[PDB]
Amino acid sequence: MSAALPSIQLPVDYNNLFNEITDFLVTFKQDKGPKYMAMLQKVANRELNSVIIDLDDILQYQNEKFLQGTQADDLVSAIQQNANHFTELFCRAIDNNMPLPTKEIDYKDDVLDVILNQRRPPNLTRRYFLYFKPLSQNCARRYRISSKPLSVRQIKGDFLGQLITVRGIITRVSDVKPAVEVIAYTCDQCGYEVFQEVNSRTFTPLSECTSEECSQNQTKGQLFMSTRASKFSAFQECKIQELSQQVPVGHIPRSLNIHVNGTLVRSLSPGDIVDVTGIFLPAPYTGFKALKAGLLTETYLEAQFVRQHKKKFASFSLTSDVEERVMELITSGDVYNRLAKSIAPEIYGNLDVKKALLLLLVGGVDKRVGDGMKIRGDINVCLMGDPGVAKSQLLKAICKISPRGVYTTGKGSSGVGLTAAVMKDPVTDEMILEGGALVLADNGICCIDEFDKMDESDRTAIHEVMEQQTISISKAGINTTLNARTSILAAANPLYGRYNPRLSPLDNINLPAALLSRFDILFLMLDIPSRDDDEKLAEHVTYVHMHNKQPDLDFTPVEPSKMREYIAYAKTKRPVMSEAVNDYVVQAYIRLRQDSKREMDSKFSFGQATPRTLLGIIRLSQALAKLRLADMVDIDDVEEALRLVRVSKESLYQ
């Protein structure tokens, strides 16, 4: 029947496709030996579980062919399309030529290579996954694209399967789980195997004996399956949600789904900027059997590579150049105050507060008792003060620069939005939990505004969080002691807006010292007019609004990428403190304790210095030592710590 399924032809020629691919697999020498064959040798050594595909190298070999007068036979223009078919062709090409194992197989190794040699479709003979990664356009510009950062709404429909790069934010990803790719059916009588292949969501088992020997046999002895011979591969799904600035006017964004497998399942975590790459493929769903016209398809995407502009603290390994960046950073000098200055230069002054934020970012040092207890190397700050002065630029910059950051309002969804939730997972029946704003932050930073307007529930939660890094819940199925390990940074305003110079801070402020005691630091930022300072204050504001470029000082504040690199490097150390500084710290603690208790019980008096004050001083001195990058503490740091502590409230006396 030529009518149905009639003939048609296209420029595609698999004959030369395969030849070109296989020649590339072996001709690579521009960047051991042929490093591609060397990585194949590593795979023979059972070193990795997923090959890496570089595409600009394919472009470069096409350049080689062009320069040598050969028909370049550009295959990338087709690989950008229909990658789902080219994956199984590249796998076949690799399987065709796999080098031999330079090392021997022993009892201490992967338990799969032994079986592979024991029995030594082609899918079950594959010991290497594959995960592409698209080019970076910076080099596609060199010599002269296809995939730019796109949106959850700009799919356009026609992009089903092409090469794409979509950005956004991951909200919820299920836990990794196994998924079959090839079945292992062994015969009871024939003693021969069978390969049942499944690629859809479901299937039906093969029970009756259709074995090849049973074919020439009256009897058809039953067969069964294996739990180790049958192939397997992981399967995990994620959801993107569109970035804010690219949403059209008054338009509510929408969602999307992706599918993942095998190796790269671990490179995703909710709440981070991401640039997913892969191909957008369909799936068998047609609405639900009443609002249907046929041919409808629910859809998904393929995950093959992850790059994110936000580098978590766990990616820190030095190289031949980043140490050079650190070196040239530290050579200039005045690094500490220079950091304090570069922290959010959009606002004016308050170098003390920017420094306090820097030390909040640093966090401190972790110490373990070893007797069934540890202590947090963590900081908690507040910036009490009247309105008018800048308050939210700090928090917004902190969330912009610090990773694992979070922002929340004061009132609204604080009832459970800051706490554990209960939900059933889509891709599998299970009662998974996703936490509130605090929980999405961990070993990171958090921000809060208008703390006085929050609920007593929020106060109770943050009270427990500040001193202890857990959380307790006794509402429902959740009966957990959840780990927060978060850094709190709140802000609010007095009861009367502007300060009450005739009343003490302990009365003007609305928060109780029963909770504020845990707040190791506290600034009172209030404003009084002065003829001269406001001159250049207006100068600064007018200049920054004339153009975003901050004042043209002989100084260059640096990118948050470099700042996070530096903070990650500084987080590696764990310095020590001598007795020469310990005794001075003890003397200063006694001085402050007695002075504040006996004298400061009056107008401008706030409570009293505490053991938590001493612990915070120690933690901040440790942070100073970490910044200096020395494993010891100098006497030249406690002076700075106490200077800032007593300068935090200098304006209370004017």
Ligand X SMILES: Nc1ncnc2c1ncn2[C@@H]1O[C@H](COP(=O)(O)OP(=O)(O)O)[C@@H](O)[C@H]1O
Bridge partners of residue 471, in order along the sequence:
482
- 396: part of which helix (H) or strand (E)? helix 392-401
> Is residue 228 a contact residue for other proteins (CB under 8 A)?
yes
Instruction: Among 177, 292, 374, 603, indicate the residue that binds other proteins (CB under 8 A).
Output: 177
**372 with 479: CB under 8 angstroms?**
no
Residue 390 contact partner, candidates Zn ion, other proteins, ligand X, none, CB within 5 to 8 A by sort of partner: ligand X
Contact flag: residue 130 with other proteins (CB under 8 A): no
**Residue 511's binding partner, choosing from ligand X, Zn ion, other proteins, none, with beta-carbon cut-off 5 to 8 A by kind?**
none
SS3 string of 32-72?
Answer: CCCHHHHHHHHHHCCCCCEEECCCHHHHHHHHHHHHCCCCC
Give 431 or 537: the residue with its C-beta nearer to other proteins. Answer: 431
Of the pair 347, 362, the CB lying nearest ligand X is at 347
273 in helix, strand or coil? strand
Helix H, strand E, coil C: the string for 606-653 is CCCCCHHHHHHHHHHHHHHHHHHCCCECCHHHHHHHHHHHHHCCHHHH
Choosing among other proteins, Zn ion, ligand X, none, which partner's interface includes residue 402 (Cβ < 5 to 8 Å by kind)?
Answer: none
Shortest CA distance to 238 belongs to which of 264, 215, 257, 261? Answer: 257
348 is an annotated ligand-binding site residue: yes
CB of 640 to ligand X, least distance (A): 25
Residue 168 phi/psi, 5-degree rounding, is 145, -150
Q: Residue from 10, 100, 252, 314 that binds other proteins (CB under 8 A)?
A: 314
Parallel, antiparallel or unpaired: strands 305-307 and 273-278:
antiparallel
Alpha-carbon distance 376 to 467, whole Å? Answer: 8
Amino acid at site 640: E
* Longest alpha-carbon distance in the chain: 108
Q: What angle do CA 491, 493, 494 make, to 5 degrees?
A: 140
Site residues (vs ligand X, CB under 6 A)? 347-348, 387, 389-393, 541
Distance CA 292, CA 290 (A): 5
| Contact by Cβ (8 Å): 488, 466 | yes
Six-digit token string for 136? 């970076």
Span interacting with other proteins, options 17-25, 59-67, 173-181, 595-603, rule CB under 8 A = 173-181
Q: Does residue 518 contact residue 380 with C-beta atoms inside 8 Å?
A: yes
The answer to whether 227 contacts other proteins (rule: CB under 8 A) is yes
**Rounded least distance, CB 402 to ligand X, Å:** 18
The whole-angstrom separation of Cα 65 and Cα 551 is: 53
Q: Output phi, psi for 468, to 5 deg.
A: -115, 140
Site for Zn ion, rule CB under 5 A: 187, 190, 209, 211, 214
Q: Which residue, 516 or 568, has its beta carbon nearer to other proteins? A: 568
**Closest CB to ligand X among residues 390, 652:** 390
**What kind and span of H or E run contains 424?**
strand 423-424
588 part of the interface to other proteins, by CB under 8 A: no
Residue 531 makes contact with other proteins by CB under 8 A: no
Nearer to other proteins, 299 or 596 (CB): 299
CB of 423 to other proteins, least distance (A): 12
Query: Least distance from C-beta 527 to ligand X, angstroms?
Result: 9
- Among residues 155, 176, 281, 568, the one that binds other proteins under rule CB under 8 A: 176
Task: Show Cβ contacts of residue 52 under 8 Å, excluding neighbours closer than 6 positions.
Answer: 39, 131, 133
Per partner kind, with CB cut-offs from 5 to 8 A, the member of ligand X, other proteins, Zn ion, none near residue 187 is Zn ion
Candidates 7, 9, 200, 474; binder of other proteins (CB under 8 A) is: 200
649 C-beta neighbours (distance < 10 Å), count: 14
Closest approach of ligand X to the CB of residue 509, in Å: 16
For position 49 contacting other proteins by CB under 8 A, the verdict is: yes
Alpha-carbon dihedral angle through residues 457, 459, 464, 467, given to the nearest 10 degrees: 170
Binding of other proteins by 390 (CB under 8 A)? no
Q: Which is nearer to other proteins, 385 or 444 (CB)?
A: 444
136 binds, among ligand X, other proteins, Zn ion, none (CB under 5 to 8 A by kind): none
d(C-alpha 224, C-alpha 205), whole Å: 9
CB closest to Zn ion, residue no? 211
Rounded Cα–Cα distance for residues 476 and 425 (Å)? 18
Q: Which residue's CB is nearer to other proteins, number 263 or number 409?
A: 263
Residue closer to ligand X by CB (options 75, 390) is: 390
Are 403 and 310 a contacting pair, CB within 8 Å? yes
- 533 makes contact, choosing from other proteins, Zn ion, ligand X, none, with CB < 5 to 8 Å by partner type, with none
The minimum distance between CB 194 and Zn ion, in angstroms, equals 8
Q: Quick one: residue 550, left, alpha or beta (phi over 0 = left, psi -120 to 50 = alpha)? A: beta
Phi, psi of 432 (to 5 degrees): -85, 160
Build a one-symbol-per-residue string for 272-311: x at contacts with other proteins by CB under 8 A, - elsewhere: ----------------------------------------
Question: Binding string, 260-279, against other proteins, x = CB under 8 A?
Answer: -----x---xxx--------
611 lines the binding site for other proteins (CB under 8 A): no
SS3 call for 365:
coil
Neighbours of 547 (CB within 10 A): 7
Under rule CB under 8 A, residue 427 binds other proteins:
yes
Q: Is 380 exposed, middle or buried (0-12, 13-18, 19+ CB in 10 A)?
A: buried
CB of 448 to ligand X, least distance (A): 12
Residues 6+ apart with CB under 8 A from 176: 234, 235, 236, 265, 266
Which of the choices other proteins, Zn ion, ligand X, none does residue 205 contact, using the CB cut-off of 5 to 8 A by kind? other proteins
Of residues 480 and 605, the one with the C-beta less far from other proteins: 480
Tell whether 493 is in a known binding site: yes
Q: Which stretch binds other proteins (CB under 8 A): 37-45, 312-320, 510-518, 610-618?
A: 312-320
Q: How far is the CB of 198 from Zn ion (least distance, A)?
A: 20
Stretch that binds other proteins, among 79-87, 103-111, 501-509, 527-535 (CB under 8 A): 103-111
Binding partner selected for residue 393 from Zn ion, ligand X, other proteins, none, CB under the kind-specific 5 to 8 Å limit: ligand X
Q: Which does 118 bind (CB under 5 to 8 A by kind): Zn ion, other proteins, ligand X, none?
A: other proteins
Residue 612 marked as a ligand binder: yes
Q: Could you say which DSSP state residue 123 is in? A: G
Distance CA 652, CA 500 (A): 10
Q: Which stretch binds other proteins (CB under 8 A): 109-117, 299-307, 508-516, 634-642?
A: 109-117
**Residues in touch with other proteins (CB under 8 A):** 49, 107-108, 110-112, 114-115, 118-119, 175-180, 198, 200-205, 222, 224, 227-229, 232-235, 265, 269-271, 312-314, 404, 420, 427-428, 430-435, 439-440, 442-444, 479-480, 482-483
**Which residues make up each annotated binding site for ATP?**
348, 388, 390-392, 493, 518, 612
